[PDB]
Amino acid sequence: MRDLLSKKSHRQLELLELLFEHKRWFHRSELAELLNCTERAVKDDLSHVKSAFPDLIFHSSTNGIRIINTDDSDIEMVYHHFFKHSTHFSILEFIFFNEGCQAESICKEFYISSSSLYRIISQINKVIKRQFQFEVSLTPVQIIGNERDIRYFFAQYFSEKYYFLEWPFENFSSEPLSQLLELVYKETSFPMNLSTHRMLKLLLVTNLYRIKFGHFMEVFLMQAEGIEGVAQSFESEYNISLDEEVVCQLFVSYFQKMFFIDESLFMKCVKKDSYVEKSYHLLSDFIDQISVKYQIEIENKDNLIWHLHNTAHLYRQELFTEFILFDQKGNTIRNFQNIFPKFVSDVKKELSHYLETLEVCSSSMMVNHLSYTFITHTKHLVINLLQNQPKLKVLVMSNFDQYHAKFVAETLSYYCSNNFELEVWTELELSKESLEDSPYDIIISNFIIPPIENKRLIYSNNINTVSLIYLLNAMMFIRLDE
Amino acid sequence: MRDLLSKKSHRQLELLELLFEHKRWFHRSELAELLNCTERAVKDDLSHVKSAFPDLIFHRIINTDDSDIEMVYHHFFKHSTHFSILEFIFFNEGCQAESICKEFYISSSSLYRIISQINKVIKRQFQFEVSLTPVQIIGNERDIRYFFAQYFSEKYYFLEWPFENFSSEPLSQLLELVYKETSFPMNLSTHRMLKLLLVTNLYRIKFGHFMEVLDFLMQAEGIEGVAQSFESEYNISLDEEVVCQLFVSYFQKMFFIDESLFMKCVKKDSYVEKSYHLLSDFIDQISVKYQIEIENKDNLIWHLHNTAHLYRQELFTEFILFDQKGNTIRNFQNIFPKFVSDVKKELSHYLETLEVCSSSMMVNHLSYTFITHTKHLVINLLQNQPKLKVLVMSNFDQYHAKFVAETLSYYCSNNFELEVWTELELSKESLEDSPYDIIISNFIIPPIENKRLIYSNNINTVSLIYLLNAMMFIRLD
Numbered sequence A: 001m002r003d004l005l006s007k008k009s010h011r012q013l014e015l016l017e018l019l020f021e022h023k024r025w026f027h028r029s030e031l032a033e034l035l036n037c038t039e040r041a042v043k044d045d046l047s048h049v050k051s052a053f054p055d056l057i058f059h060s061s062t063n064g065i066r067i068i069n070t071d072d073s074d075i076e077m078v079y080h081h082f083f084k085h086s087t088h089f090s091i092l093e094f095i096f097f098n099e100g101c102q103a104e105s106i107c108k109e110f111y112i113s114s115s116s117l118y119r120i121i122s123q124i125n126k127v128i129k130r131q132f133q134f135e136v137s138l139t140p141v142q143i144i145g146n147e148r149d150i151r152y153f154f155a156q157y158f159s160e161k162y163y164f165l166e167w168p169f170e171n172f173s174s175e176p177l178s179q180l181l182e183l184v185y186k187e188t189s190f191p192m193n194l195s196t197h198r199m200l201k202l203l204l205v206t207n208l209y210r211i212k213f214g215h216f217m218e219v220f221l222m223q224a225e226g227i228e229g230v231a232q233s234f235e236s237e238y239n240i241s242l243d244e245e246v247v248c249q250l251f252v253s254y255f256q257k258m259f260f261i262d263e264s265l266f267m268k269c270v271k272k273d274s275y276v277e278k279s280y281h282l283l284s285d286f287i288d289q290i291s292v293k294y295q296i297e298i299e300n301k302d303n304l305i306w307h308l309h310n311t312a313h314l315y316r317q318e319l320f321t322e323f324i325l326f327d328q329k330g331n332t333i334r335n336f337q338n339i340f341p342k343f344v345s346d347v348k349k350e351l352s353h354y355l356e357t358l359e360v361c362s363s364s365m366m367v368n369h370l371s372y373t374f375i376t377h378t379k380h381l382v383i384n385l386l387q388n389q390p391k392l393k394v395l396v397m398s399n400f401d402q403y404h405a406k407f408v409a410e411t412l413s414y415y416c417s418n419n420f421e422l423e424v425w426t427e428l429e430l431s432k433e434s435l436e437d438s439p440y441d442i443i444i445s446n447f448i449i450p451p452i453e454n455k456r457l458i459y460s461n462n463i464n465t466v467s468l469i470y471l472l473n474a475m476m477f478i479r480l481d482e
Numbered sequence B: 001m002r003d004l005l006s007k008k009s010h011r012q013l014e015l016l017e018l019l020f021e022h023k024r025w026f027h028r029s030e031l032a033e034l035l036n037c038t039e040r041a042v043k044d045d046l047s048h049v050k051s052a053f054p055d056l057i058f059h060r061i062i063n064t065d066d067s068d069i070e071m072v073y074h075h076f077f078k079h080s081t082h083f084s085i086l087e088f089i090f091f092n093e094g095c096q097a098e099s100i101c102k103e104f105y106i107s108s109s110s111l112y113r114i115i116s117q118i119n120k121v122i123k124r125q126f127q128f129e130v131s132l133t134p135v136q137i138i139g140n141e142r143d144i145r146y147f148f149a150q151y152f153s154e155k156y157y158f159l160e161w162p163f164e165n166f167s168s169e170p171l172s173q174l175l176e177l178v179y180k181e182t183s184f185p186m187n188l189s190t191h192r193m194l195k196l197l198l199v200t201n202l203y204r205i206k207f208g209h210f211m212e213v214l215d216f217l218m219q220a221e222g223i224e225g226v227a228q229s230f231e232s233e234y235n236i237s238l239d240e241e242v243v244c245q246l247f248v249s250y251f252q253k254m255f256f257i258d259e260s261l262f263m264k265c266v267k268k269d270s271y272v273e274k275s276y277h278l279l280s281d282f283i284d285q286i287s288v289k290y291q292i293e294i295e296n297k298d299n300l301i302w303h304l305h306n307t308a309h310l311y312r313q314e315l316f317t318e319f320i321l322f323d324q325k326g327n328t329i330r331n332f333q334n335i336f337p338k339f340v341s342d343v344k345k346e347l348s349h350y351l352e353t354l355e356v357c358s359s360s361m362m363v364n365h366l367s368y369t370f371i372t373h374t375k376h377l378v379i380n381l382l383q384n385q386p387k388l389k390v391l392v393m394s395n396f397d398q399y400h401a402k403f404v405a406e407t408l409s410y411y412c413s414n415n416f417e418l419e420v421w422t423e424l425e426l427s428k429e430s431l432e433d434s435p436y437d438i439i440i441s442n443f444i445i446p447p448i449e450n451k452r453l454i455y456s457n458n459i460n461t462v463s464l465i466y467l468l469n470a471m472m473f474i475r476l477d
């Protein structure tokens, strides 16, 4: 959907994504070709970007250009900005909030001619249909086509464009939806937490705008206590009549046949239903295969299988699967893959085979999401992945006496990572040779010694103990650097 | 002893010590004023310094924690004709003065000037002098032996052996043989210090320069193999006089080689009892005030008593140019200024009350001794600092937050306590009201007064571990 942005905006977005992803230096030569533009475009984009994001710290050098600051800020800032300043997205969102308005109100709202609005809507619809089956219409003003696609597009859009704590929905306050969700939580099995609750509020508020104008999806709460208080809110706040049809339209996605809200019922269906048996079998063989290969002990196999099955049988119903501008899910999995490339590549291939064998959606967005799901549901995963990594041996010596070396060694052993094993030198003599033949990865001393091949030396004479702790801790993942 | 260096060299040295000590950004006016010199002088020192030590990098200097500061001291020793001549003379007792003129390409008149100047400087601290008729070093023998052993510890690297006349091995096997038959600690540091003291003492013993004042040793196993090495390697007869002269420092009346003997002397000698009483009240006072567990008080008292009653007998107490002991205490003092100020005052009072050496050199060394003999010091010193509370949130789902929380709680300092957000709603005010010190999130929130925010979207878990651990002593700040 980034083709809804202007050319300049699109290019600046990619420039910033590059600089946030890579901490290296970049000459304008390199930026020009990586971003497939001219050096003039790069220069113009850079100064536009400097002024738009003044907090971001840009150094220039003999080495080139880079952002120094990225660990204080976050790329969400950039998207938040390019969404906010985009004309096409703004119009689209205006239309979403104003079904039935006069086309002319849109022209007035955005200071554009009627012919310009028709050109814009034409461009918007062209971009949208590359991925989603819906379109904007001006006669009358509405969004039509595949209802599931529309609902997904906008909930995801709102999740990307607005900060987590923002509530940009003027027609619809959050409270009645919260009150409704409270009721829902008591009598159901949804996880109850801030993340899932925010996502549900966005899905539901998006669905209310559809429901208010009769745009419906093809498919206990009515007699829970409190229901009439909620039903009153909906009438008062939203002017909507809270009945069975509404409730069904709000939560349609959780009536998917192969979604199992109940874990125990899933496990029962595994025994009766040959499609479900097959899903279960594939996921069970995947999990065993990965567990044996990476020696990962897994705690609750069947619960994990249930979760993977469910995740794989939803399509454009959970947010952070498909993205508009910000592939946050994808970036998260890529960061983990940077640490553990072979592991992540193996799970992606197994899960891709799972999706393809069942003939469900097997796009990279779903492969990424499912892999992410497996990872984040797995206990002590990082411990297990690093289990073949021997401890780093650290020698500590003092030219004063051994009480000093022991004092330091004990202090560091206590405060620094248990990846390290700290020891003192126990022989009477020392020589370059006996240091070379020693097993140490790191040597800390307050006197100078010749370089010792394959040993990192920390000279500690001008370093206090606290600084030394910080310094040694920065080396805790040396083995991971192979 | 730095006044022995040329005025320029001396100033260049203090320049570098300032740079290495302080990380503060420096401009020429601060330097000139701090060093007490012209800006022309500072400009020229800087040029010279960069020329002499190319591997240093000035942007203020950014290399310091990674740089060979000993090489700095070596350099100034070597290029001091005064120090070089002093050393040559130490190794060449009885030579003709003309040999020194020849070796250093100087006239006899400038040699006599140099000697005068050396004697003038040394005399301020140590009561000995160099003589040219005949060529020898004379005066207080303990001062001489200390001066040179300490000089050699500062001028040469730990692994170097500058003594051409004397191999280390005969001396090693003597020490070995001594360790076996005694209570002396066996470790590389004390072993190196003893070798330097002894090799120094041998040069004195070889010309009959003796200290004014062991049976077992002469009938111990292997003594003849050792004594043969001494005769063949050093041209010296290993006897009761030599052994005594090699180890004189440890027959001090108030030095106690064994803890049990010290403790028996506490009951029968009123001076020893006084020493024990002062140290015991100091230790109790500091332990209660800073809540420090002292397990083996008597062992600590014994060590502090011993240390306080050696004078110019242990290296790294007084320095020639490089006050490494003092810098080590100053570094510790940077972290715990009040603790260190208290121990120094208590130990200064201990020393003054007994009327032993109470120089800042001895106060620094005794304080260093107290610190390094104490078990769990830093831990005890930080015990009132609460755990840092860390909140982890994800916009995806709570599994993600728990995955990250568990990984970070395992790998990061036990100074942290990681938790997830358990309420359904989040708001700026509930975050402000929360007790978290650090918030890790993959979604932007507004600044929350007094909370450090770490955003995680472009950071992998390993990077996140490094970033969190860098904050492990926030409270200490």
Ligand SMILES: [K+]
Residues within 6 Å of the ligand: A412, A413, A414, A415, A416, A417, A418
């Ligand atoms: K530890």
Ligand code: NI
Residues within 6 Å of the ligand: A281, A285
């Ligand atoms: Ni099978």
